[PDB]
Amino acid sequence: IAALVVDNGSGMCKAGFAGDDAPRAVFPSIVGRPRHQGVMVGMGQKDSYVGDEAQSKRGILTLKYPIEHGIVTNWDDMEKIWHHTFYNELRVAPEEHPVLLTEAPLNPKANREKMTQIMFETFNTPAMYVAIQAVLSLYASGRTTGIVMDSGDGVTHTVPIYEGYALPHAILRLDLAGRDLTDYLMKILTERGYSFTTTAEREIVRDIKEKLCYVALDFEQEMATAASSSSLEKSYELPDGQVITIGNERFRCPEALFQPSFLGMESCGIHETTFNSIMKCDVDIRKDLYANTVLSGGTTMYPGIADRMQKEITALAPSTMKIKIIAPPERKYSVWIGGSILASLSTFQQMWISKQEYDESGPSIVHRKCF
Amino acid sequence: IAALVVDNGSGMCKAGFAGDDAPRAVFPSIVGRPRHQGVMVGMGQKDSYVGDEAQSKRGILTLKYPIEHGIVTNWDDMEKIWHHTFYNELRVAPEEHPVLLTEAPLNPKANREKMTQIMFETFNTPAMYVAIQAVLSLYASGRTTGIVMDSGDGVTHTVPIYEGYALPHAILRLDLAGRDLTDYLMKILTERGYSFTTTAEREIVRDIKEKLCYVALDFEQEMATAASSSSLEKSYELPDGQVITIGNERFRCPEALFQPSFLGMESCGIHETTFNSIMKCDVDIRKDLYANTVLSGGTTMYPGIADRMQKEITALAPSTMKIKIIAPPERKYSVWIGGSILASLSTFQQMWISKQEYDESGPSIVHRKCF
Amino acid sequence: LKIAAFNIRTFGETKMSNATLASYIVRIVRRYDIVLIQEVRDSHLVAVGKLLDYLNQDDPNTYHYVVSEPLGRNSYKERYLFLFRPNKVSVLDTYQYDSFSREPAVVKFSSHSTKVKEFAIVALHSAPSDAVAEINSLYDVYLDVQQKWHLNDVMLMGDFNADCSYVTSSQWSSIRLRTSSTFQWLIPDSADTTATSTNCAYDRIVVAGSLLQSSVVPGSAAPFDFQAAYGLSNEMALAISDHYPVEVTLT
C-alpha cells in the first residue's frame, strides 16, 4: 500500500517509509564474515553481521564495503545487506508494497540491470523504480532549477536542472569523495607520528574527520597561522584510551576537495567542476543556475564549506553576478528526503515498473521506462 | 670532496667514502649497556658497547636495537653509534666533509628534524642531504624506470619511479620485515622443543635464518614431502655443542613474507603489496613498471625469492606480459652503492643543505629542500 | 580437562601493546582447555581478536570464543570470555542471567571424556562492596538452573572478592552455599589467589551436584603460581595480572 524508499549508497544505507520527514533505519553499509568460529551469549552462530553489529564488534570481523565509488562489486553480500534492512530494521515484509532505489548518474548499465533482477526475484517486490541521486536532491529544496552538488562517500557528481529539464550532456562525475579523504588522512597523519593500517582501526580515522576537519577560507594564509600557533590544535580520545593532538592536518585533508592534485588525480577541483558543468549549458540559463546552487551529501557538512565555495566561484564567474550557495540544515539525509516526496506524489504513480512489464521483455526495462 | 655516505638503517648500518664500490664499515647497529659492572683489562667502554664488540660479548651485555621499524627511539643511543662510526671505524673527522643520509619513505617529520639538528650541532657537519632509501636503489642498477622494493630489516616498501618522477601517491609502507621474521622462527622453534628467550638466543636464530631458510616455489607441495621425507631436514650445530634439526621450519619462516596471517598481520603480502603500488599508477606507465622490478634489501637473499615472486605476480597480472624480476648481484649493499654514485655526481652538488642555510630558516629547511 | 578462571587486570589494547606480556598470556591459556577471562575492558572486541590469532594461528579450530555483550549495570561494562577447545567440550546453550553490577553468564559444556556428561558454568565478578549482597542471590540462581535446565551439575566460579576484610565471620554464615552441603567451596582461605605477596583467596571455586562432587580430582583445585613456575620477577607477575589463576581439574 505504502511506498518503500531506500538510498542504497556507499557508507550509509538510509531506509524508511514514504511520507516521513526522516529515515527510520540508518546504519553503516558494512557486512563482515567472522574469521574465528565462536558464538556469543544466546546466539546461534550467525553467518554474517550487517551494519551496527559490524561496528560494535569490529575486532573479529573482516569488514568489507560492498559499494565502491557507487559501483556494486559483489552481489552475494548486497543480497545480505538488503535482507537485513527489510526484515531486521524496518520489520516489514517487502512483498507488500513497492520499493524505490537510488543510484549515482553515469553508472554502468550492468549495475542497474542486476538491481532490477534482484528486486523481482529475491524479494518479489510488486513495483520498483530507480532515480538519479542528484534529481531527488532537488525535490527536498522544492525548487525547479539549479545545479545539484551530490558529493557522497565514493562518487561526486553535478546534474544541472532547469525548469524540470535535465541536461545529460552537462553531467560531470568525479570520483574524488569522502572515502578518498579517509585514505588520504592516514598518510598525512603518518607525518605527525600515528599509524593507521587495519580496516578495523580505519573507522578511528573516520571519527577524526567527522568531528575535527574544517575548511579554511585561505589555504596559504591559514597554513602560516597553524604553523606558528597552538590555537589550531585540538586533542582527541581514541577508543583504546590514548590521546592525540591534531594541528595543521585538521584542514589539509578537507582541502583535497578543492585541489585534487594532492591525491594524484588530474581532475579539477570540486569548485572547478561546478564551473565547467555550468559552462556546458546554454548562455541564457547560466544566470538562473548561478543564483541557485544546492549542496548535498555527507562531505558538504564541514564548517565553512559554503563560504569557501562562494569565494572560489566568484573569482571564476564574471562579476556583477549573484552567486548564492544554498546549504540548508539537514542536508546529510537530503537525498532520501526527496525520495519520500516523490513516492507520495500522485503523478509518479503512473511510472512504476510492474512485474508485468519486466516479465514480457526481461530486465531491459530499466533503460527505457526508467530514466 | 670525499663526502661520506652512511645508511644507518635497522639491523646493520653501512658507512664509507664516496666513489668506493663497496662499504668499508659494516657492523650491527647494536649498542648495549652492561648488566654487570665488571671491567676488562684497560677498557674504557664502561658506559656502553657499540659495534662488533657488543656482538662478540653478547653474553654479558644487554643488546638493544635503537632503530625500530625505521624509527629512532633512543636518541641518546643513536649518538653512540654515530660517534663510533666516524672515529673508531672510518677513522675520519666528520667536520671535514659533508655527509648524506638515507631514510625510509612515509616517516614522521620529527625523525628528520632531530636528526638534522644533531649533526649540525654535535658534529658541525658543513652540509648534509637526506635521500629516500628506495630511490637510491635505482642508481646501483643504473636505470631510470622501474619500481623499487627495499625489503629492509625493519621496513618493507615499494616506491615506483618513472623517468625520474617519483609518484608521491603510490608509495606503500609495510611493517613486516626481516626482524619480525626472526621472532616468528623463535615461536615455531619453541614448539619444536628448543627454547630461545634471552637476547643472546635472539642473535643465534638470526644466524640460523640467514643460513638455512629458503623460499619454497609451492608452499603446499613441501608439506607433502616434509611429512614424508627427511631430506629437507638440515642439522645446524648450536654454539653450546648441541645439534638441533630443522624440519619444515626451513621454508615456513620465509613464507611469512607472502602470508602475513601467520603473525596476525592483517596487511597484504609482499607479492600483493607490489601489485597495489602498480595499480595506483597511470595506465600508460603500467607497461614499463611491469618490466622492471628492482629487488633490494637483506631479506631478499633467500634462495628462489625472485623465482617465487615471478610466479605469483604473473598469475595475478594479466597474461601476455613481460615481468622481469631483476635481482642484481650483491643486492644487500644496493642502497649504499647507489649513494656512492649519487655523491660523486656533479649535478648533485647544487642541492646540499649548507650550514648557513640551516641557521637562517632553522631546522625546518629539510621539508622544503629535501624530498 | 583443566578448567580455570583467569582474572586478567585491565585487559585490552593497553596490555596487548606489550609483546612480552602477550607472550606469557598466550602460554598460560594453552594450559587449560576451558578458561574464563574476566573484566574485559575492551568495547569493540579488538583485544579478543588479538588474543585469538596467537591461539588459532596453527589451526582455525583450536580455540573458540564465547564473548558476553556489554552487561555492566553500573557505569562501566566489562565482558566475560569463554575460550574452549572444540574437541574437548562443545557449547550447546548459553543465556544471560534471567542486584548485580555485572550479571552472571550461564553456558553449557558437553564434556564427553569426564564422567559428568552435562554440566553448566556460571561466571561472576562481584564488586568489592557488592559481595555480601550477591552471594545470597547466587543461591537463587542455582535453583533456576535446576528446573529450567534440568541439569544436575552446576559450577560457579569467578572473582567473588571474598575474605581480606571484605567478608567477616558475622556475614560468613549469610551465604547459603556455605551452609548447604551441596555447594562445597574448594579453595581454602589459607591459599593466596593474588599475584601480590599478601594472602588473599579472592577467587572461590563452588561445586554443586552429587555426580560432580566425585568428578573433581582431589586436591587439583589450587592457585597456579606462574611467577615462580615461569621464573619471573614480582614486577612481571604484577604486570600480567593482579590475581593468581585458579584451576580445577575434571576427571
Binding site: 605527525r192 600515528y194 599509524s195 593500517t197 582501526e201 | 625500530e68 624509527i71 | 609483546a19
Partner: peptide, 7 residues
C-alpha cells in the same frame, strides 16, 4: 611510533 604500532 606514538599510537598504532609499538614504536
Amino acid at each position: 611510533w606514538x599510537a598504532x604500532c609499538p614504536a
